[PDB]
Amino acid sequence: RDNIQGITKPAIRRLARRGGVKRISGLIYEETRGVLKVFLENVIRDAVTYTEHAKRKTVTAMDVVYALKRQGRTLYGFGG
Amino acid sequence: RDNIQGITKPAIRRLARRGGVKRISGLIYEETRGVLKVFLENVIRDAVTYTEHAKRKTVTAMDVVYALKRQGRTLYGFG
Amino acid sequence: RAKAKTRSSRAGLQFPVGRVHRLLRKGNYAERVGAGAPVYLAAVLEYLTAEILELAGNAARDNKKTRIIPRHLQLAVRNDEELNKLLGRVTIAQGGVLPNIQSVLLPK
Amino acid sequence: RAKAKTRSSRAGLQFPVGRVHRLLRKGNYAERVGAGAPVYLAAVLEYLTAEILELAGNAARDNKKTRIIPRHLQLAVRNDEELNKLLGRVTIAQGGVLPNIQSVLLP
Amino acid sequence: HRYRPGTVALREIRRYQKSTELLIRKLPFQRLVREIAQDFKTDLRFQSSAVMALQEASEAYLVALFEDTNLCAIHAKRVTIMPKDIQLARRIRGE
Amino acid sequence: RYRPGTVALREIRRYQKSTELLIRKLPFQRLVREIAQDFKTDLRFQSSAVMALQEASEAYLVALFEDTNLCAIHAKRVTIMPKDIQLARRIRGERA
Amino acid sequence: KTRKESYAIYVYKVLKQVHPDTGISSKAMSIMNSFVNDVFERIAGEASRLAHYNKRSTITSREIQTAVRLLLPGELAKHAVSEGTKAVTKYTSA
Amino acid sequence: KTRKESYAIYVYKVLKQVHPDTGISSKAMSIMNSFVNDVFERIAGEASRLAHYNKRSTITSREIQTAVRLLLPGELAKHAVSEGTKAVTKYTSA
Prior knowledge:
Chain F: Its main location: nucleus. Chain F: Keywords: Acetylation, ADP-ribosylation, Chromosome, Citrullination, DNA-binding, Hydroxylation, Lipoprotein, Methylation, Nucleosome core, Nucleus, Palmitate, Phosphoprotein, Ubl conjugation. This is part of a larger assembly, with two copies of chain A, two copies of chain C, two copies of chain E and two copies of chain G (94 residues). Chain A is mainly α and 80 residues long. Chain A is built from three helices and three strands, in the order αβαβαβ. The longest helix of chain A has 26 residues, at 28-53. The radius of gyration of chain A is 16 Å and the shape is elongated. With 108 residues, chain C is mostly helical.
């Protein structure tokens, strides 16, 4: 399952456009995919640890929010 | 009292040399002095608040340590 | 027995003093909680909420809308220096980004 | 009565288990503290202390010195990836900096 | 008729800074999240809110990183962002 | 005579090997007292407090100068410029 | 069903006090609730640390005031402090 | 002339276990004591937060283990966990 290619080049281009980037090099996409994979790996590992400590089997939104707060990226909108 | 000028050009040069800087422009000393003044103002304000809450007139090292820690700058070796 | 009146009504607030006191007691914060701490905390929370809601309502009115959406909250937070500093490391869902473009990229 | 044996000796540790238990109970962390938590905490603390002390002693030995000074502690911390990550926002007094010169500025 | 290069880019910059939607398709991101979580636990279920929160956090992080990368690229008297800018921004930020 | 860049490299090697403070203690103490005079009057400072402030300030400045050197090298330069300091501070989130 | 306490009605009352003719959506309500919880937790934690530093075992209004002055930046803090006093004194009068 | 508890003797015992012929200065002792205090506070706070999240009033070995796994990075954490487990097992045996 090579789903890291699901983050298509137009999606990364749109994300850069929201950030104010006017011209994008052709090698940006692979680096962006790697960075996204690393960030997701860290957050998901923390969330899975939180879920496993609770003896559950579903990763709830509270676990993701707590993991993001642990990394220092407090997210408003989901849970409390 | 213009003691902000007490941080001399050779001192800033030594600080830059410790950081690996090879060549230094002559227009960065004022910027470094301003940055140092801002950082000191923030830390000392927090330390003075901590001292005032304790009803004291002496700024102990523990107050400075707490002020540094609350800004994510934990310091080891003073308590 | 005299008719019961809430502590928040006594202090002239809108936030619950009793709920804040219960949260402070059950939150494992300190062994004892003073009687004036919940009032202070409720007043501070109400003031902050009123400020941010006023800014968001101003933004929504400037956008010709009669309902507050997370975009308005994001605009209100980011347009105020003190609120931006307070919420510097906070992400608001469905907030977007502040519209700006570097002067270098603009054509001459 | 039976002779008093410290909980640290029973678990084979050197860090105090009773002191850690008292700090946990008096530290306002939770309403109740289990009987096995202080042992786990003391074991973790002892392991971390042994790791950092061994690294600092190795640095001092490689520096051809006997005692341990804060410079050796800084050298031990900054040269280990996991320890550097753990103490990422920690400043050690009289520790200096790791020798690092960029290759661009090299002649 | 054909717009000169850089015009549609500025139009897209203005358009995507006014909207608040998600710029990554939901199904590919959900599949990626499930595949990543497969390496930690087996037979894991995901709430929709968890996937949405992950998507929002990832999008915000990438937007901030791209802003910093654009600043780095402009600093070097350039307009095109390159992987060196991303690496420098990540190094300075402490990652 | 030594060509430029040699004594600078020698100083870089020397100051990266020592652990001593690089700012004179009395001027720094005077500056700290001047800054603290604004928040309160007739304040007393322990020597340990001033030492801790000096150590924290020196470490912060050294880290900032390392980031500034990286920024300057990125722009294909050797000379540190104020714009590099400003960019490093903006990216780190201090002046942002 | 188990009741879920939240800062929903109070935020709406404050909004009606400020903007009598403006509503608020569910997502904005959740964001407001999260913001209130986060600020409450930050202030309470700072107050607890302040109480522990001085070897005292009681959270009073002075600890909350110092925590507010430490956390809230600039003019905001000052205003907040005033509001706090403007409440406590009133609570003493009754 | 009051008692001031510190992690001075235990650090010296560990050092003598690791390096029997190496001494330690006072500044290094202060740094080690501060490091021990900081790590203890971090782990205890994370365990308390974990216990509060799951509506539990007790801090047990599971909470400490999960806090160690969350905080300590890399193989370090794993090794630490092993040590702790062994200790608990020994404390159960006697």
